[PDB]
């Protein structure tokens, strides 16, 4: 059965022009843009078991000393958390005659390499935004698994991460989220283990000699594609996400974006002091709606913004509150409910 595993002959026929030469210009039509992996800071773990974060969980609150009293000495407690890196790689397996009869090798390698690069980038962004290693044991913890719980009330100071998520009333499979990460030496950053290298590493293995279980030695060619990284959210005061954003709304005038964004901005307890570069990543539905509520035309019972000629259409959504708004396609408009912590 199958027919989907290796690069069959039909695909090679499809990847060439009518003149009989392999196509140099391939329409992707499935590439995505994800600058999270571009603006992210990453450095080698360069340590033992893993990257280490030290969190304080106790204060030596002073005592109202009466005169002739012995104040009991106090200690400051600390809590430690470590985060690990993850590794994935993908391989290309093609018959050598599949190459030779295509009259062109380097072109076929270029096409397959570009496709593999795009695939890995998309996969990596998807796992960064959703690394639910709770049920994986690989695919290092991303961002959604850490904040996949919100607390409705009592969200005064960041006692847990359930105070870093804002309900928006959504329901159904049309929910989404907005992340506002801060990349910095202490805020949060990417991570790769020592000895390896940053970014995607690709290796051309040349002609192989694929040996079959039942005595078969047909000759194949392979390319290596390797890229590993890990995350470390040192502070849950540096990441705030909005849950239950129902896309049945947000296209009509039912949920105001800037209301939730300001609510979250003030939930970001560590923008009062510069820790590092900030960002607010969206899914291009949020940005569409944001330009729909920042340059309003015939909007529904709202939008105190008052327009002028030459400014009736809209300009851009580049910066939220000085935070650059980088548009990341990895985010999905289906995320399932993030529940309310009781």
């Amino acid at each position: 059965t199958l027919g989907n595993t290796y690069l069959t002959l039909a695909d090679v026929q499809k990847q060439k022009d009518g003149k009989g030469n392999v196509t140099s210009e391939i329409i992707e039509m499935l590439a995505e843009t994800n600058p999270i992996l571009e603006d992210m800071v990453v450095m080698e773990c360069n340590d033992g078991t893993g990257h280490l974060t030290t969190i304080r969980t106790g204060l030596p609150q002073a005592t109202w000393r009466r005169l002739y009293e012995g104040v009991q000495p106090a200690k400051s407690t600390t809590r430690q958390i470590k985060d690990s890196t993850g590794t994935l790689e993908a391989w290309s397996e093609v018959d050598e005659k599949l190459v030779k009869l295509s009259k062109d090798k380097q072109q076929l390698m270029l096409n397959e390499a570009a496709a593999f690069l795009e695939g890995m980038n998309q996969t990596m962004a998807s796992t960064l935004f959703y690394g639910n290693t709770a049920t994986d044991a690989v695919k290092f913890m991303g961002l959604a698994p850490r904040f996949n719980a919100y607390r409705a009330a009592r969200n005064l100071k960041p006692v847990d991460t359930a105070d870093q998520v804002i309900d928006a009333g959504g329901t159904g499979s049309d929910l989404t989220s907005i992340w506002m990460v801060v990349w910095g030496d202490r805020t949060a950053h990417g991570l790769y283990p020592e000895g390896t290298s940053a970014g995607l590493q690709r290796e051309y293995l040349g002609a192989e000699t694929k040996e079959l279980g039942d005595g078969g030695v047909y000759r194949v060619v392979r390319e290596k594609f390797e890229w590993d990284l890990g995350l470390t959210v040192r502070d849950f005061r540096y990441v705030v996400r909005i849950a239950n954003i129902d896309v049945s709304d947000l296209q009509a005038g039912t949920i105001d974006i800037y209301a939730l964004l300001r609510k979250a901005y003030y939930r970001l307890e560590n923008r009062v002091i510069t820790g590092g570069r900030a960002a607010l990543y969206c899914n291009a539905d949020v940005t569409e709606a944001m330009d729909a509520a920042a340059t309003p035309t015939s909007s529904t019972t709202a939008s105190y913004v008052r327009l002028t000629p030459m400014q009736v259409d809209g300009k851009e959504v580049m910066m939220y509150r000085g935070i650059p708004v980088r548009e990341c396609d990895a985010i999905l408009s289906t995320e399932t409910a993030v529940p309310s912590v009781a």
Binding site: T1, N4, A10, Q13, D17, G18
Partner: protein, 129 residues
Amino acid sequence: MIMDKENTFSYKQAITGTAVSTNVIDLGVSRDIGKGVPVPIIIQVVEDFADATSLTATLQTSETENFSSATTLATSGAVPVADLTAGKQLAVQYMPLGTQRYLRVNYTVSGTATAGAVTAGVVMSHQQN
């Protein structure tokens, strides 16, 4: 011909009874591969048929591993056994249009057969005369 292993529906399959193809070519994405540059196919009968009567040779396509509901893209009709010799093609030259998700070949036979085989599958370039 340089017909290869993977995208091949059946290799010398007897289908003497009312059987179906074995290697169901499955594609995750509905490419509908016939468009643009063509892809040659064969359902050429590879060894003669003895006591069959009809060999309806549908090219059923469906949207599930098991073909719960299938769609026909090429049917040879009730070809009488008098023509089921070697080289008797049973469908069009190149890939048809409409290959939605999965592809398996049916071999409805009127009555049973004591001999018969086919080599339906994708070919890089046809052989003619």
